[PDB]
Design an enzyme around this catalytic site. Structure first.
Site, mmCIF file in Angstrom:
data_model
loop_
_atom_site.group_PDB
_atom_site.id
_atom_site.type_symbol
_atom_site.label_atom_id
_atom_site.label_comp_id
_atom_site.label_asym_id
_atom_site.label_seq_id
_atom_site.Cartn_x
_atom_site.Cartn_y
_atom_site.Cartn_z
ATOM 1 N N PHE B 140 0.858 -1.178 0.000
ATOM 2 C CA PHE B 140 0.000 0.000 0.000
ATOM 3 C C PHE B 140 0.895 1.228 0.000
ATOM 4 O O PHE B 140 1.783 1.345 0.850
ATOM 5 C CB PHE B 140 -0.922 0.036 1.224
ATOM 6 C CG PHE B 140 -2.188 -0.751 1.059
ATOM 7 C CD1 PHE B 140 -2.184 -2.135 1.207
ATOM 8 C CD2 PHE B 140 -3.388 -0.114 0.772
ATOM 9 C CE1 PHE B 140 -3.356 -2.877 1.060
ATOM 10 C CE2 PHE B 140 -4.567 -0.849 0.625
ATOM 11 C CZ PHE B 140 -4.545 -2.234 0.767
ATOM 12 N N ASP B 226 10.138 2.008 1.082
ATOM 13 C CA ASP B 226 9.026 2.858 1.500
ATOM 14 C C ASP B 226 8.968 2.845 3.025
ATOM 15 O O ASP B 226 8.400 1.934 3.634
ATOM 16 C CB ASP B 226 7.722 2.382 0.868
ATOM 17 C CG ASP B 226 6.544 3.290 1.195
ATOM 18 O OD1 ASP B 226 6.718 4.228 2.000
ATOM 19 O OD2 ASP B 226 5.446 3.072 0.647
ATOM 20 N N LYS B 255 4.267 10.992 6.624
ATOM 21 C CA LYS B 255 3.418 10.871 7.806
ATOM 22 C C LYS B 255 4.018 11.522 9.053
ATOM 23 O O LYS B 255 3.813 12.718 9.273
ATOM 24 C CB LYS B 255 3.072 9.395 8.013
ATOM 25 C CG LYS B 255 2.377 8.857 6.763
ATOM 26 C CD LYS B 255 1.630 7.539 6.898
ATOM 27 C CE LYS B 255 0.927 7.235 5.558
ATOM 28 N NZ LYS B 255 0.312 5.880 5.403
HETATM 29 C C1 LIG Z 1 -0.109 5.526 4.283
HETATM 30 C C2 LIG Z 1 0.974 5.056 3.347
HETATM 31 C C3 LIG Z 1 1.263 5.758 2.176
HETATM 32 C C4 LIG Z 1 0.313 6.813 1.648
HETATM 33 O O1 LIG Z 1 0.700 8.123 1.988
HETATM 34 P P1 LIG Z 1 -0.409 9.291 1.957
HETATM 35 O O2 LIG Z 1 -0.672 9.657 0.509
HETATM 36 O O3 LIG Z 1 0.102 10.468 2.754
HETATM 37 O O4 LIG Z 1 -1.678 8.767 2.583
HETATM 38 C C5 LIG Z 1 2.430 5.469 1.471
HETATM 39 N N1 LIG Z 1 3.308 4.494 1.911
HETATM 40 C C6 LIG Z 1 3.027 3.801 3.071
HETATM 41 C C7 LIG Z 1 3.971 2.746 3.569
HETATM 42 C C8 LIG Z 1 1.864 4.081 3.787
HETATM 43 O O5 LIG Z 1 1.594 3.395 4.940
HETATM 44 C C9 LIG Z 1 -1.166 4.700 4.095
HETATM 45 C C10 LIG Z 1 -2.158 4.504 5.244
HETATM 46 C C11 LIG Z 1 -3.409 5.366 5.051
HETATM 47 C C12 LIG Z 1 -3.986 5.238 3.654
HETATM 48 C C13 LIG Z 1 -5.244 5.904 3.298
HETATM 49 O O6 LIG Z 1 -6.006 6.356 4.192
HETATM 50 O O7 LIG Z 1 -5.517 6.016 2.080
HETATM 51 C C14 LIG Z 1 -3.348 4.528 2.707
HETATM 52 C C15 LIG Z 1 -1.894 4.299 2.831
HETATM 53 N N2 LIG Z 1 -1.269 3.764 1.873
#
Ligand SMILES: *[C@@H](c1c(COP(=O)(O)O)cnc(C)c1O)[C@H]1CCC(C(=O)O)=CC1=N
Ligand SMILES: Cc1ncc(COP(=O)(O)O)c(C=O)c1O
Ligand SMILES: N=C1C=C(C(=O)O)CCC1
Lengths: 402, 402
Positions: B140, B226, B255
């Site tokens: 993700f 990541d 984050k």
């Molecule tokens: C957070 C996430 C991302 C996404 O970053 P952002 O665009 O700021 O949300 C990228 N890489 C990793 C490892 C990671 O955990 C998450 C968790 C929250 C989320 C959502 O609410 O859409 C999706 C994510 N991929």
């Protein structure tokens, strides 16, 4: 810590993805910026129309300072007490059922693409992954892989791997080309700027937005209006589409949605489009956080309470009228709406747009060129007439000094 | 304005792309959140690990309050005085030449894909638009069209139009699979999470990251780590890759980079990778703005000054040891590193992870399920041992109440 020290530090430790105008700001207030040596400049970029309300507007600053002490981020895995108040305000202001909150302009653009495709398959009945989205040549809506897949600017897409399929491109300001593209029943949406910003403030012909709306309705295609730069009073109306009384199926807002204090972007549309995305199917960590929502409420309140749309309309007419007094031997065109304007420069061997902005900087006005012969003029909408006319004399003397 | 009013307002005016846990917060401080009825909760999600420093950390709050009065956004069309200071700080902290600043985590991910592709073509010499990027199943990294094209979760990609080509997917925690995939000379990069977050805190075997580093180096492929969720002390090290002393080619941070006060993300790599992107070929309006830079410096300083990494390591050991005392056929597995942990539920239809989190909330602890039988436990890293032990007894009481 000099301007030259600032340039060199970034050259060593920062990526070279930008070539900025050589000026190093440390303070901003309203229409003015100050560099580290204390020089004062008129801001005629407004950070790509993100500080419509002027730099460090006290009401927006106060909103940020008030909220940062209580709660800044729960994620949308929980509720907070602020998001819903912002959602009710923005949806009733722009008269759409729902808003989907994101952070940056690209993310809103990507959200609209996902909505258009999801609507295409689940409502229009397009066979899965044949849905197309039409874009206009010259469009700029960010620098993700998908966004550059719709670009016609080789600097944006060259070298960046295979491109996203399902993106068709037609000329801007071209209703017959739109109708030709909409014959394909697999088209789900048309995304277009009411005025193309990064293309050089390209204003389409009167009636274009009415033709787009009619054509989109006739062929059951979502009309996506990207107002991330033209909206929120910049062109003299709440939305630049208001000039033609046109109602898009999806509106994109951003940049000035926060007065430059926080990355906030928004996607507005009715239930029949918005609810094609189910719980779990789209999101963003910072999207809709209470800190950005407080800032955005205050930033919308500023635009309304200070009547910046009418100020931008009235002062924009003065700006273009005066700029058209420059001889056609040196300035070939003047265009724009409200306080989003540009001039086209008679590019020669002696000069170009970068050299003019270098001299505009020397004379206390910050503007940036868009590609060789075009200069954007977009000051904060809180500028007053006398400050505007002083700005114009700076532009006049600079242009004529070459 | 009750909790129920807040749920109903968002149901009416906000998109339904989430279904949150029904709790309405209005204040946060450290490890605690308060709802609009005044009830107090342990935060065991930390907004997907964005508030490692605890809610509203005063040093980060003060940095935001101090900077917002001076200057918040110039765009990178001009220089400001803060960005280069942040760039020098973060690059020397992690020992990479340069940093490319963005806003959200997915924007950092898109930047890394663009760097990998442009490096693949201009340095490795892959024929243009044959460059591939390999991902691990269960990854993700956001919800753009390109992020979901690499996803194996149907909820993330189903219905969202044709997908980005050039993305390959292999099993996680599988070195033979990576070795097989890296036989293709057109692979430019492998992007992987040191611990898969949204997949359910999937911790790979000891030695996986060393083997990824070796295989990538063996086949001249960029190792993109990541660390947007695992980094910045959350797992008990500055970076989760530190547990095996591996140095990736590209590190993604986000984050917690801001303590939850501003959307800040970063892409770190050396000159030979970073400089493949030339001026004008990548950017973002709010990327590198002086407001987010100031809070990011303060956020990183908090992690160092308060030695949160070793607190997360030590308390994580206590947390997992205590959770493993729960009955084996009710809690079937406990896993994690530092304070990024999860339990796996013996899911029947007399209960599931969602019902447990509802009762966790009733007992004063906020957690979110990620798969119906998995619950993540990720409290802020400023949590103390006695606070953690009270949290554990809340979990014990909740689990043993079914
Ligand atoms: C957070 C996430 C991302 C996404 O970053 P952002 O665009 O700021 O949300 C990228 N890489 C990793 C490892 C990671 O955990 C998450 C968790 C929250 C989320 C959502 O609410 O859409 C999706 C994510 N991929
Ligand atoms: C019209 C328009 N759309 C989208 C964007 C992208 O916004 P951002 O840089 O916040 O991603 C910009 C800037 C823009 O001017
Ligand atoms: N499409 C856009 C691109 C920008 C950037 O990437 O800097 C700023 C203007 C909006």
């Amino acid at each position: 810590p000099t301007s030259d020290d600032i340039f060199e530090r970034e050259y060593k430790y920062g990526a070279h993805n930008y070539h900025p105008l050589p000026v190093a700001l440390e303070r901003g207030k309203g229409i003015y910026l100050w560099d580290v040596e204390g020089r004062k400049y008129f801001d005629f970029l407004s950070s790509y129309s993100a500080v419509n309300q002027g730099h460090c507007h006290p009401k927006i600053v106060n909103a940020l300072k008030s909220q940062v002490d209580k709660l800044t981020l729960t994620s949308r895995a929980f509720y907070n007490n602020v998001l819903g108040e912002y959602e009710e305000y923005i949806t009733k202001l722009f008269n759409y059922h729902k808003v989907l909150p994101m952070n940056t302009g690209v993310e809103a653009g990507e959200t609209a693409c996902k909505l258009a495709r999801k609507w295409g398959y689940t409502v229009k009945g397009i066979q899965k992954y044949k849905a197309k989205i039409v874009f206009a040549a010259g469009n700029f809506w960010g620098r993700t892989l998908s966004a550059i897949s719709s670009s016609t600017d080789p600097t944006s897409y060259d070298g960046f791997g295979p491109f996203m399929p399902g993106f068709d491109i037609i000329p801007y300001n071209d209703l017959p080309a739109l109708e030709r593209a909409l014959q394909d029943p697999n088209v789900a949406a048309f995304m277009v700027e009411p005025i193309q910003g990064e293309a050089g403030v390209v204003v389409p012909d009167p009636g274009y937005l009415m033709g787009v709306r009619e054509l989109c309705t006739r062929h059951q295609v979502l009309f996506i209006a990207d107002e991330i730069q033209t909206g929120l009073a910049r062109t003299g109306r709440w939305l630049a589409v208001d000039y033609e009384n046109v109602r898009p199926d999806i509106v994109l807002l951003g940049k000035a949605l926060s007065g430059g204090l926080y990355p906030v972007s928004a996607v507005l549309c009715d239930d029949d489009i918005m609810l094609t995305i189910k719980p779990g199917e789209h999101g963003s960590t910072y999207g809709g956080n209470p800190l950005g929502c407080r800032v955005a409420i205050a930033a919308l309140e500023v635009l309304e309470e200070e009547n910046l749309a009418e100020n931008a309309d009235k002062l924009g007419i003065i700006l273009r009228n005066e700029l058209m007094k420059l001889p056609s031997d040196v300035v070939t065109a003047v265009r724009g709406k409200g306080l989003l304007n540009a001039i086209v420069i008679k590019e020669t061997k002696d000069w170009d747009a970068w050299k003019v902005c270098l001299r505009l900087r020397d004379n206390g006005l910050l503007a940036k060129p868009t590609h060789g012969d075009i200069i954007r003029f977009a000051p904060p909408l809180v500028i007053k007439e006398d400050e505007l006319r002083e700005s114009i004399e700076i532009i006049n003397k600079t242009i004529l000094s070459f």
